[PDB]
Design a protein around this ligand. Structure first.
Ligand code: ADP
Ligand code: BEF
Ligand code: BEF
Ligand code: MG
Ligand code: MG
Lengths: 99, 77, 192, 539
């Protein structure tokens, strides 16, 4: 058996093409953190207890604060995260509605 | 119920004979450790400041209401 | 002499003193369907009901074709005679001891026993004989030429039940002189 | 919950001991562990689980005991509830999930009385009282009974075939109602799994066709044999002995001394068989079903005689074909005299013996039995995971029907047997008094777990239904003789409102609730009696 290669120009990467990592795999990775602050919106929304990189506890209703205290990988997820950080500096409120 | 369970009293036979006797015997009836039974704690001289009991309850709830608010624990490596 | 047998299922509630004997094994049912024999007389067997060999190293050597068909002839016969001598003493229940020795009770002998409506219970430990002998007013039987109506039991009913899906063997009502007296108690319980 | 320290006085090997409070708790925690897995799976609004073998191979089910069977349980007081879960599935067939969740709350609550101050002997006496009163109440709230089509359909919902409940309702009822049999000179019971269930992946779920005979999962051994025989009065030979060539009986050896006997003795090894084959063909046998083997030698005899003849078929199957067609199982045929004869009256009369092709698999159907009705169910559907469960869902539903037919009593289920017991026992609590009161009181409210989780599983609010249900059951104790006119009971979960479960058709069998609690108690009793555990490490 055994499979050949496609192309070796680089040092060891990964490419997410055909909009796949965008049209499906990105939407659903966003949905994971969409369902997160979906239950934090408004007065009936629930707080989330987040233990950071140094063991310090942080509990917040805020989307932007709750997202700032997480370590994130997925690039397309990171996009809406900086967007929640945008409306944090530029209005204070609405951070949960950005998301 | 705990002061009883600690001292080894009958926890249910004291609370049961206390709840009944608190609706007819007024506020100051509590556990008198010296006879293993119910009694007025003014004359028993069991005294404690105002702040203790109000700050106790105001905190005990702050905790209880904070924990129920939590729906997700995320912990990083 | 007090017999306490276990079977899982139910509740401690379901425990009962049996008015006779409880047994460990079950009706063979491989051939036929005898299980609940009424107005019964119990025989108790030490011996093997097989096509048996003597205690010495023996082997049927075959010379002719005409020796063959006649070997099965006596084989079929030998097993039938034992089953006939049983029906002839007039018992409808068989109890047979441990066959770890050699033979057991043959599958060919078992169909004879079935169509002849004698209900069979095989594999019964040697310890169990002393108790079963007294408990079932039945003298133990070693050789066929010593199987007699004389040494049979005369119990009222023998019927294997179905408890939890798992059977037990009942002997209720025992007629004769109980010079030796024996009890049997069935214990049930929800958890092992 | 700090890991305890081994005593400095006692000396036990490959074994440590936890005492008093540490054990009591560990038992309740492990009991909840087992119970809480399968709470999600309770009620019509309940769901199913996916259980990975580890190889990826899996099974999907609701049937509680099979879920519990599958979970690797490590704690004694977990495996006890699992041992009960199955003790259910061998004494009722359904209710396996319920009985486990009851036992758990009985322990849990019992403990929270000890974790207060109340002694365990008091509570265990207080559980004895309630149960003596609950079963007495159940029998006075049972209804002795069309009705079978409900009892089937109640065990349909909560499981996969509940969406097609009406079909798999009249399947179950007729299938069983056609294997009636007497034993022990009058016992009229419906055989515990006589309806042979087969499952083949094809067609639709609705197209699962009941057999008006019996389903054998075997084929006509030789391909030249007729794969069908039809018309009235067909003769079937139910065999048990193999049709092959024998090694010299048993203790028999061969010493050839006269060469001419080589072929003489060798040829006669064919005869005995061919002679027994002939005594079968010549008996008027058209179809042969043999538990043990058929030789190629004895097939060529059936082939040319147009006898559709099967080999190596389950004796479990053949006896239920013996009892149904008229046939008698032939272990071996020897007469009054030594001679080996085979009378024609040995065979079973039927309608047809047709080998029917189902989704890439042929199997023989014995159609239209003469000696007594016989029924078999051939399931159809999506894949093997699909079929597996709807067979287990049938075994549960055929079961509840059996116990209805075995015992002339049904209970209005839908959690109203439970809900009614809550307030009856709670009011009975005053009749005794003292500390024994809180015990029955905790028991009465420990029965809340059934009606509670049923409505939790709907995702929406529970307490709305739960407490408003209690009031309706509290409307039967203040209800006068004539004024009955106030008495009603039950619960609906799809629409989510309190309904009359006798008129609605929600019906669980009588025993299904007695042998349900009876067991559930002798579970938590044993666990509550535990105050010290001593665990000793392997050989
Ligand atoms: N249509 C229904 N409406 C209300 N209650 C139901 C309905 N069907 C079943 N039930 C209740 O749910 C229970 C069925 O439990 P189930 O989840 O099937 O597992 P198990 O039968 O093993 O306990 C029964 O006790 C019955 O009271
Ligand atoms: F999520 Be916000 F800025 F109240
Ligand atoms: F979940 Be069950 F055995 F109806
Ligand atoms: Mg806001
Ligand atoms: Mg069910």
């Amino acid at each position: 058996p055994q499979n050949p290669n496609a192309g070796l120009f680089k040092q060891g990467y990964n490419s997410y093409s055909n909009a796949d990592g965008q049209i499906i795999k990105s939407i659903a990775a966003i949905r994971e953190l969409h369902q997160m602050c979906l239950t934090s919106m408004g007065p009936c929304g629930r707080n989330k207890i987040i233990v950071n990189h140094l063991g310090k506890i942080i509990i917040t209703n805020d989307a932007a604060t709750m997202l700032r205290e997480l370590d994130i990988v997925h690039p397309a997820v990171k996009v809406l995260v900086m967007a929640t950080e945008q409306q944090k500096i530029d209005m204070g409120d609405g951070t949960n509605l950005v998301m | 119920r705990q002061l009883c369970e600690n001292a080894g009293f009958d926890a249910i036979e004291i609370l049961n004979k206390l709840r009944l006797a608190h609706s007819k015997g007024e506020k100051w009836y509590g556990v008198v450790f010296e006879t293993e039974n119910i009694g007025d704690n003014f004359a028993k001289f069991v005294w404690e400041p105002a702040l203790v009991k109000i700050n106790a309850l105001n905190s005990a709830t702050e905790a209880t209401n904070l924990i129920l608010s939590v729906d997700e624990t995320i912990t990083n490596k | 002499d007090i017999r306490l047998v276990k079977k899982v299922g139910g509740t401690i509630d379901d425990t009962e003193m049996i008015d006779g004997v409880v047994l460990t094994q079950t009706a063979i049912k491989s051939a036929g369907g005898p299980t609940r024999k009424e107005k019964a007389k119990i025989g108790l067997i030490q011996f093997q009901i097989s096509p048996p060999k003597p205690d010495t190293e023996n082997n049927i050597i075959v010379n002719d074709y005409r020796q063959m068909d006649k070997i099965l002839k006596e084989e079929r016969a030998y097993l039938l005679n034992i089953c006939k001598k049983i029906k002839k003493a007039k018992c409808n229940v068989l109890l047979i001891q441990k066959s770890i020795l050699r033979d057991a009770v043959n599958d060919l002998a078992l169909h004879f026993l079935s169509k002849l409506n004698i209900m069979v219970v095989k594999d019964i430990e040697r310890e169990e004989i002393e108790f079963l002998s007294k408990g079932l007013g039945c003298k133990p039987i070693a050789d066929i030429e010593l199987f007699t109506e004389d040494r049979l039991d005369s119990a009222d009913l023998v019927e294997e039940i179905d408890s939890d899906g798992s059977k037990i063997v009942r002997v209720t009502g025992i007629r004769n002189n109980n010079a030796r007296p024996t009890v049997s108690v069935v214990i049930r319980g929800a958890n092992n | 919950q700090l890991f305890n320290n081994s005593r400095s006085d006692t000396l036990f090997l490959g074994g440590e001991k936890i005492s008093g409070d540490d054990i009591r708790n560990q038992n309740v925690l492990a009991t909840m562990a087992v119970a809480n897995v399968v709470k999600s799976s309770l009620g019509p609004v309940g769901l199913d689980k996916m259980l990975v073998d580890d190889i990826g191979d899996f099974t999907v089910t609701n049937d509680g005991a099979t879920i519990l069977s599958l979970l690797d349980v490590q704690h004694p007081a977990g495996k006890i509830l699992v041992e009960l879960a199955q003790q259910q599935d061998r004494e009722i067939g359904d209710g396996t999930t319920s009985v486990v969740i009851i036992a758990s709350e009985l322990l849990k609550r019992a403990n929270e009385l000890v974790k207060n101050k109340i002694h365990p002997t008091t509570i265990i006496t207080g559980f004895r009282v309630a149960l003596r009163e609950a079963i007495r109440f159940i029998n006075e709230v049972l209804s002795t009974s069309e009705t079978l089509i409900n009892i089937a359909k109640t065990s349909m919902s909560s499981k996969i075939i509940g969406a097609d409940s009406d079909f798999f309702s009249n399947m179950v009822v007729d299938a069983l109602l056609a294997v009636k049999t007497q034993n022990s000179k009058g016992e009229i019971k419906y055989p515990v799994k006589a309806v042979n269930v087969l499952k083949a992946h094809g067609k639709s779920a609705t197209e699962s066709l009941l057999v008006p005979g019996y389903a054998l999962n075997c084929t006509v051994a030789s391909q030249a044999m007729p794969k069908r025989i039809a018309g009235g009065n067909v003769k079937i030979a139910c065999l048990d002995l193999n049709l092959q060539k024998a090694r010299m009986a048993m203790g028999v050896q061969i010493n050839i001394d006269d060469p001419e006997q080589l072929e003489q003795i060798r040829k006669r090894e064919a005869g005995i068989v061919l002679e027994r084959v002939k005594k079968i063909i010549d008996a008027g046998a058209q179809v042969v079903l043999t538990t043990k083997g058929i030789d190629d030698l004895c097939l060529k005899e059936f082939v040319e005689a147009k006898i559709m003849g099967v080999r190596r078929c389950k004796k479990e199957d053949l006896r239920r074909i013996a009892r149904a067609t008229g046939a008698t199982l032939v272990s071996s045929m020897s007469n009054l005299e030594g001679e080996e004869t085979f009378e024609s009256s040995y065979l079973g009369l039927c309608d047809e013996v047709v080998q029917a092709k189902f989704s890439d698999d042929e199997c023989i159907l014995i159609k239209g039995t003469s000696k007594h009705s016989s029924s078999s169910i051939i399931l159809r559907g999506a894949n093997d995971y699909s079929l597996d469960e709807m067979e287990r869902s049938l075994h549960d539903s055929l079961s509840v029907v059996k116990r209805t037919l075995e015992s002339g009593n049904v209970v209005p289920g839908g959690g109203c047997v439970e809900a009614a017991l809550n307030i009856y026992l709670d009011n009975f609590a005053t009749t005794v008094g003292s500390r024994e009161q809180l015990a029955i009181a905790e028991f009465a409210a420990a029965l809340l777990i059934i009606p509670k989780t049923l409505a939790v599983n709907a995702a929406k609010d529970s307490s709305e239904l739960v407490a408003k249900l209690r009031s309706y059951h509290a409307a039967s104790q203040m209800a006068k003789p004539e004024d009955r006119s106030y008495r009603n009971y039950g619960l609906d979960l799809i629409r989510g409102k309190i309904v009359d479960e006798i008129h609605a058709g929600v019906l669980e069998p009588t025993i299904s609730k007695v042998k349900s609690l009876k067991s559930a108690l002798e579970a938590c009793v044993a666990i509550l009696r535990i105050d010290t555990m001593i665990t000793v490490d392997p050989e």
